[PDB]
Amino acid sequence: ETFKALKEYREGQHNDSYDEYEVNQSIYYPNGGDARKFHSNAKPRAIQIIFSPSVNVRTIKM
Amino acid sequence: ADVAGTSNRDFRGREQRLFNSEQYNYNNSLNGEVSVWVYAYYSDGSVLVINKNSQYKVGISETFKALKEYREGQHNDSYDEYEVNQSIYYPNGGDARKFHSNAKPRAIQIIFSPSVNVRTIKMAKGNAVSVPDEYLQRSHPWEATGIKYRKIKRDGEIVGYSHYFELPHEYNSISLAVSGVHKNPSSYNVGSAHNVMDVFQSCDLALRFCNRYWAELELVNHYISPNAYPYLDINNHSYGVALSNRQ
Amino acid sequence: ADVAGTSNRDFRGREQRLFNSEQYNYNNSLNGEVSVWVYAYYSDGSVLVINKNSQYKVGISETFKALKEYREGQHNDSYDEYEVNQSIYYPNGGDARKFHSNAKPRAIQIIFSPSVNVRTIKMAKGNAVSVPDEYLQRSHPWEATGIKYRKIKRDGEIVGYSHYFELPHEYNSISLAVSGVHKNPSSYNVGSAHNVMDVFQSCDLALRFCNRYWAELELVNHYISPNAYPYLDINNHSYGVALSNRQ
Amino acid sequence: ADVAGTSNRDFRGREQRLFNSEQYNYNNSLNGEVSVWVYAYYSDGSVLVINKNSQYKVGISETFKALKEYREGQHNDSYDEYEVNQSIYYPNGGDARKFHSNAKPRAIQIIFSPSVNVRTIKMAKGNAVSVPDEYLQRSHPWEATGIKYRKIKRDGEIVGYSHYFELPHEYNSISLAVSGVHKNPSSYNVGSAHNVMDVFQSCDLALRFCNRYWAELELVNHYISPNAYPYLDINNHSYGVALSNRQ
Ligand SMILES: Nc1nc2c(ncn2[C@@H]2O[C@H](COP(=O)(O)OP(=O)(O)OP(=O)(O)O)[C@@H](O)[C@H]2O)c(=O)[nH]1
Ligand SMILES: Nc1nc2c(ncn2[C@@H]2O[C@H](COP(=O)(O)OP(=O)(O)OP(=O)(O)O)[C@@H](O)[C@H]2O)c(=O)[nH]1
Ligand SMILES: Nc1nc2c(ncn2[C@@H]2O[C@H](COP(=O)(O)OP(=O)(O)OP(=O)(O)O)[C@@H](O)[C@H]2O)c(=O)[nH]1
Ligand SMILES: Nc1ncnc2c1ncn2[C@@H]1O[C@H](COP(=O)(O)OP(=O)(O)OP(=O)(O)O)[C@@H](O)[C@H]1O
Ligand SMILES: Nc1ncnc2c1ncn2[C@@H]1O[C@H](COP(=O)(O)OP(=O)(O)OP(=O)(O)O)[C@@H](O)[C@H]1O
Ligand SMILES: Nc1ncnc2c1ncn2[C@@H]1O[C@H](COP(=O)(O)OP(=O)(O)OP(=O)(O)O)[C@@H](O)[C@H]1O
Ligand SMILES: Nc1ccn([C@@H]2O[C@H](COP(=O)(O)OP(=O)(O)OP(=O)(O)O)[C@@H](O)[C@H]2O)c(=O)n1
Ligand SMILES: Nc1ccn([C@@H]2O[C@H](COP(=O)(O)OP(=O)(O)OP(=O)(O)O)[C@@H](O)[C@H]2O)c(=O)n1
Ligand SMILES: Nc1ccn([C@@H]2O[C@H](COP(=O)(O)OP(=O)(O)OP(=O)(O)O)[C@@H](O)[C@H]2O)c(=O)n1
Ligand SMILES: Nc1ccn([C@@H]2O[C@H](COP(=O)(O)OP(=O)(O)OP(=O)(O)O)[C@@H](O)[C@H]2O)c(=O)n1
Ligand SMILES: [Cl-]
Ligand SMILES: [Cl-]
Ligand SMILES: [Cl-]
Ligand SMILES: [Mg+2]
Ligand SMILES: [Mg+2]
Ligand SMILES: [Mg+2]
Ligand SMILES: [Mg+2]
């Protein structure tokens, strides 16, 4: 997934879509955007990766 | 004339030092202001500041709702946020479409000006329905929290006092009021009969300010620093201007 | 050990009774809260509650406009409601598209906590432009209405005091303020010079709460009952919790 | 110590040169990335970039619709643009209110990193319904276009490879996929049985990036240059960073 694809998207609700384009520009290059917020609450705060028991753990790559 | 910075006849230097010393001491006289600031920090990095400036005594009191982030001229999920409030006032009392409102404060910083007497500070940190301690019947209406205030210092001078507390847990849903009295080392009680109606007028004359700044950088640059206010940032850096006996 | 509920050594029972008695008496000490609630009832069955909790004395003051129903996050006919207000402030002064605004309160209930002294209660029930009695020049700024307050009782104990008045007529357009002082059977005046600056701080520390609940059932279930507040419903049923000398 | 820039003991200089040489050669080892970029140029001067970075082999495949300009958070004539698409998929098949959609790309630039083997590059430039050459039955699924790629050079070093083609005609309505394999001058086949499951994992681990920049200046300043990517602008100016045996 891309940086953008992992950001929170609320289906059928407002998502500050224009400001969030500007947020993305500021994250891709420092000072590259014109957003109206310091930190987007759509950015993930954490990630958990889980595999089923049929994986071989030594093959996992990230 | 004597040469600058070489003798006791540098009257420009003596006047500069008195000008600053007079500002510092005027603020601490009974004719001066006492000020308080409440900073509510939001997860989007914005900060609501509420300031009250008044003679003799000063304070701020806000509801749970009033401390929540409000973005002027932008969408604020206003209907869902009513439902969030209902769920915070009573568990399972609302029908919101979110587990945690990002409008709830993540932290609070209370700052007083150097003219407060720290031993007079009182705080009522209530629950979301504005009760100080679980039930009204057993609630003392405030807690004297002065002992927890840190001195904000610049060049060795106290420029203000800070109490900071984070609200990182889901159950940290508060109402808040805070109060402090202007220093008064004299035995002239400002609230005794001679002057009590002036203290009543001070309740009317207190000036309030409130605004949401987008970042702590913006708060430092355009709110704290231009007005010579004291502040303590997330990196524990102290801001303010030392005035006593200084040029 | 002795068997429960059979002797004078049931310390768990003695401690339960003291725990409740202490809450009741703490509320009535000068260290306790005094609380007031204003309930504004609307024709859609919703109820606005405004609560203020403070030491020493407490009150609420609202304009005609502020008491009108406001549905958060829903349409409120905001332009027509400005025109309604103009027509209420002066007859034929507005251009509204309705004869009677359903946002006007149909009734008001004022409740005080049991720590108030009923003889101190004062109410300023003004007209729509915030004048207590027709013209300012002849207005006394309040009326002492304590005699009209009914005791709200539970298990024989006074849990609160209620004054209720309906506003069913087209001309019942009011502004409203109410005030009460905490009981003080002592001869220590809380506002004498020794303690007057603490009363000034109490003005700053008072906590306010306001919310619109959709029904009296919802108010009873999620506002009154969870917080052990006193209430009187439309069927004259008293709500609250008796604490003095009770388990 | 010896003086800088005067002898064979300038270890800081030798380490700087090795640091750059190691980056250049690591990229070209089988442990390194192979990257491709597709730039779609629009008449409003904006540019969509799609990048894919992966080990062993890499590619991008997009539909006619996916290459059309999409302005995030702005109006995009979305209903008329569905009708435009219907008219492009079959002549006279739609009901659009425009002759030429300004969302169609005016040009395409394909760039590969210097770790690609140019002889492995393949492109499927299909029609608007995703058929490579008029009809499926007679379509070879790609064309090996390596011979047309220009070297992008900086300080005499190849920093990347470019194929550029304009789409200035009304009939230039395409779908597009492109693919290249990482250089492998060895006789260890990365897709032979020993390592083929690592190539399958590389299909999963490939990282994609896509964004629309407002101008070629902005692309150069904030996309190409900060990331040390190769690029060729409309004035035939080459961008990139030479690393082999350089300080
Ligand atoms: N711990 C706790 N406090 C609660 C709860 N519900 C309400 N509170 C209030 O939360 C306040 C304490 O909050 P915190 O100091 O942030 O929580 P903590 O458990 O002490 O944890 P840390 O301070 O983060 O180490 C109390 O004064 C209570 O009034 C609950 O579920 N747990
Ligand atoms: N009766 C009356 N009161 C008015 C009028 N305009 C304003 N008022 C105010 O209305 C208040 C009395 O209202 P109500 O008690 O609800 O009316 P009421 O005539 O006594 O009738 P009921 O109480 O329903 O039996 C007074 O205190 C006035 O300030 C008017 O046209 N008629
Ligand atoms: N010339 C032409 N090509 C068509 C037409 N319809 C579809 N095509 C496609 O267009 C491609 C060629 O496009 P271009 O190279 O841009 O056109 P060109 O006629 O060669 O003209 P220039 O390159 O501008 O000199 C072919 O590969 C076809 O698949 C049509 O009407 N005319
Ligand atoms: N209540 C006060 N108001 C104003 N200035 C004060 C007050 N108390 C002390 N000061 C002065 O402020 C300066 C700093 O003194 P302070 O006691 O805060 O520093 P410290 O002893 O180094 O640190 P700390 O006491 O915080 O551990 C001194 O000039 C002191 O005289
Ligand atoms: N001001 C007060 N505050 C608290 N408790 C009170 C007060 N006045 C009386 N009580 C107590 O409250 C209880 C009820 O007394 P109260 O006089 O209200 O009842 P009553 O005489 O049956 O009814 P009422 O007087 O309303 O006709 C008794 O325990 C009484 O001692
Ligand atoms: N496949 C390749 N990968 C990396 N470097 C290469 C490759 N082929 C040649 N080089 C090197 O790149 C540099 C430029 O050589 P190149 O043949 O591109 O230049 P040229 O002969 O001046 O121009 P051109 O061949 O494009 O007409 C030399 O150092 C050459 O050894
Ligand atoms: N940095 C920003 C953010 C917003 N806006 C303007 O504010 C409008 C509303 O903001 P937007 O980010 O699109 O939010 P919403 O409309 O509330 O939500 P959504 O678009 O996801 O439905 C936009 O159309 C845009 O014109 C802007 O000028 N600059
Ligand atoms: N718990 C919720 C939240 C929202 N909605 C519906 O979704 C609509 C849009 O949501 P709202 O919370 O009001 O957000 P915005 O309109 O996006 O923002 P704002 O109202 O602050 O301008 C509301 O009118 C309401 O009908 C709902 O039914 N239940
Ligand atoms: N007496 C009135 C009432 C309404 N209107 C017009 O009707 C529009 C809609 O009415 P409004 O009272 O504002 O109601 P809503 O938009 O439905 O609700 P709200 O504004 O509270 O969201 C207004 O903008 C105004 O132009 C008017 O001309 N005269
Ligand atoms: N060929 C077309 C183009 C537009 N419309 C009508 O015009 C409206 C507005 O056009 P649209 O193409 O959707 O553009 P915008 O709303 O301006 O932009 P977007 O939808 O991307 O936000 C559409 O809802 C549709 O009803 C139509 O009937 N036939
Ligand atoms: Cl003084
Ligand atoms: Cl007491
Ligand atoms: Cl290798
Ligand atoms: Mg939008
Ligand atoms: Mg809304
Ligand atoms: Mg309106
Ligand atoms: Mg549309």
Residue numbers in the entry:
A (entry chain A): 63 to 124
B (entry chain A), C (entry chain A), D (entry chain A): 2 to 248
According to the publication:
Here, a pipeline where crystals are grown in insect cells, sorted by flow cytometry and directly analysed by X-ray diffraction is presented and applied to in vivo-grown crystals of the recombinant CPV1 polyhedrin. In vivo crystallization has also been reported for the recombinant expression of heterologous polyhedrin proteins in insect cells, resulting in the formation of robust intracellular crystals of the cypovirus polyhedrin proteins that recapitulate their role in the infectious cycle as a crystalline armour around infectious particles. As reported in the first structure of the CPV1 polyhedrin, the ATP and CTP molecules have a very well defined electron density in the Fourier maps.
In contrast, omission of the cryoprotectant additive had no significant effect on in cellulo crystals. The best data sets for in cellulo (n = 9) and purified (n = 7) crystals were obtained by scaling the most isomorphous crystals using a total of nine and seven crystals, respectively. By contrast, the average resolution of diffracting crystals is reproducibly superior for in cellulo crystals and the resolution limit of the best data set is improved by ∼0.35 Å compared with purified crystals.
